[PDB]
Symmetry: D2
Subunit: 248 residues, 4 copies
């Protein structure tokens, strides 16, 4: 019951890590809104999760479109109650180095990750600040803390999210809204994990002291801790959940 009486909106909640966050949040007693670019996916996943009295509802929105994400959060609150938590999990990745990256792809990666975090937070903050209560979990990555070959826009975007999190915590922690970033290591099994996939495999695994990559469930547990009132003194943190990657 660690999230009893919490109401959590999760962007990109239809699949992957976002969906695993939803499952764990429901386990802990929260009501959840899955907000995803793919409306059908958000609704199918919310149906799948709403067993045994658990309450999950789905909403379609592109986090890069201010009016759409704002409308989704408004609909979510009308449906499941005023938000107490927001997880800015929506993100995309792609390849391209500074010398050869496509400028349009660059912009889209920055938009979904950085602009989406900004716009979804902006929508949620109106209510959270009014109520002097909220918790926002942003999505960094090991790729936001160190450099990853051939991923210039993505490392820029996740780097932006890491420090934006610090900035938001500076503004809002004293006003009742905690803001933290989870920084996951590689999670292979999601759509993104598959997108980014022998000797080269072994070298990649060798960057992880724990000797395995992460699961969506591994990351979801850290997010559930940060959302909970047991983390009342945690704000502004870039919490590495990465099997040791950034420790070496």
């Amino acid at each position: 019951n660690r999230l009893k009486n919490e109401v959590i909106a999760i962007t990109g909640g239809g699949a992957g890590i976002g969906l695993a966050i939803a499952s764990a949040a429901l386990r802990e007693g929260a009501k959840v809104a899955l907000i995803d670019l793919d409306q059908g996916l958000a609704e199918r996943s919310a149906a799948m999760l709403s067993t045994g009295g658990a309450v999950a509802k789905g909403f379609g929105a592109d986090v890069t479109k201010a009016a759409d994400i704002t409308a989704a959060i408004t609909s979510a609150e009308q449906t499941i109650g005023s938000l107490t938590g927001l997880v800015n999990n929506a993100g995309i990745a792609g390849f391209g180095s500074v010398h050869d990256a496509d400028a349009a792809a660059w912009d889209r990666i920055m938009a979904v990750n950085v602009t989406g975090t900004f716009l979804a937070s902006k929508a949620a903050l109106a209510g959270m600040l009014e109520r002097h209560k909220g918790t926002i979990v942003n999505f960094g990555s090991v790729a936001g803390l160190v450099g990853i070959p051939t991923m210039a826009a993505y490392c820029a975007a996740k780097g932006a999210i890491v420090n934006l999190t610090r900035q938001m915590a500076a503004d809002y922690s004293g006003r009742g809204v905690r803001v933290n970033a989870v920084c996951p290591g590689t999670v292979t099994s999601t759509g993104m994990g598959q997108q980014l996939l022998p000797e080269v495999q072994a070298r990649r695994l060798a960057k992880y002291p724990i000797g395995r990559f992460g699961t969506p469930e591994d990351i979801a547990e850290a997010v559930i801790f940060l959302l909970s009132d047991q983390a009342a003194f945690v704000t502004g943190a870039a919490f590495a959940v990465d099997g040791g990657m950034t420790a070496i």
Copy 2:
């Protein structure tokens, strides 16, 4: 039941944050060994905690004395079972800058913090490695991540613990032992917090959240890091600091 079937030794467990960690760990179903320089206090605190079927036992040891901390860990395991977790909470603080610090005072702060973490971990690691299962939580501080005026030895000590944590995670994460460091902000109410007490408003201003931490705040982070829900968390310097290191 987040720590069901866990057996957790907590150095400095007799009081303050260590005691709060013990309370939360028992809440989550763990068996706890309080290991404290003050043997009587460890025992009395363990007795106090042991209600409602909760199992806490107290042991005396100075973490800077290898034979003594080794004996205490062995005795704990005889009493409550093989360790699954170790919290290196024992620490001392003090004042003194590089230009005026006394060498003996410097050495003692380094000893309890860094050498204690080393020796207590060394003792626990034999069993944890043998069983390919363990979780160690070390105690950094905001004072291990940034510089604090007039606390040279203490900032060096906590700085050491922060990077030693990364080093330990590098060695052991693949062998079944996670090692992490909680880095608390100021916690006023403990013996250490009291010891270190417009100057007030200035200190508070460094904390975006607008208050200092409680032992309970810190205990919750430690309980998370101890739990199997934190299975992919290792090598982390986890700031639990009201936003201090974010600005």
Copy 3:
């Protein structure tokens, strides 16, 4: 003579820190290209600097416009020689928190800082990689390492630059191109310094003063120099102790 036979392009070179970098680089024997949104300013500043045989030339370009910045870099190389160094100094700042920021202003701040760094680097990298020799200095800030109240877009932008720098170093260090970021503390006297204008502010700086454009320029000149041959991927704090406390 620390930058003898070096050819350095400096975005935002017409004024402020960029101009101070130009002055110091010329002192050390470099030829410099001042690339500024304000073309007249770039030209006037370059002429002012071109004394005692020093070679400084001005170019007009908005770093957020790929064609324009690419053209300026191409012309710089035609004018003063193939680049050996690029300083992505161009940046803008503004105020606004997540809950109330102008989304258009947010985009412009991200564009000049992050996209400008990307596009200018992209143009320079063709030649630098072809020659297996280059040094790129990006502009972070203390605002890219910690959070600053009421500056969401700018902290996001400088945060991006800090980690983009690491990413660029990962790609290119082994190919002969070092990439580093200078992270300055507050520098009062520039246009940006004045725009953003406080014993409380000063209290954030252990050294007990804010920085000068010259302070920052010296760090950039070191990073540009071959004396810094093993320095790459670094986020170098030049900040009077700000991020140390």
Copy 4:
């Protein structure tokens, strides 16, 4: 002449990186004192360096012995003038994980690195603070910023130095003494480099090579110089990109 009228004491100055620092500092016009555990080595190295008008003097001291390091600094100042800079370069390394490290070896690694930095700085700070002028460069490592397998005591010691540097900068930057740490990557060619001696190790370095003593020396000379007047509290990675990935 970047260090004209500077007077720099270098612990561990008789060989390796310390000696390279001495050479570069003399190049830039400083007077130097080499203070080394090996007195004869300090003397021989100082004599070797004292050509063409360069002034280098050697002294014997174990930095872990307060009386010895204090005497050496005093003797240095009698010979070459009041110190303006101190480089806490003396250090030792060794292997051992938490589970198997010998406690005596642990203490010795912690002592030379951390306690030596403390004691040497303490001796130098009396004069520097009295004059409201100094610059201190401590020696971290990539091993002070991240974990290195099988080097528990050394990683703890270098970690201590990195944050002690921040703490010292907090105390003294406003009192006229800058304090910074260089954090070098692997440097193969020194006594320590040889002691610790694969392609797997090299793969940790984006730049595709290990460092030289000269690479590290240049960063130290920059930090010592007044061109770095606003640089304090910094943990400056000079590491071929190691900590960037």
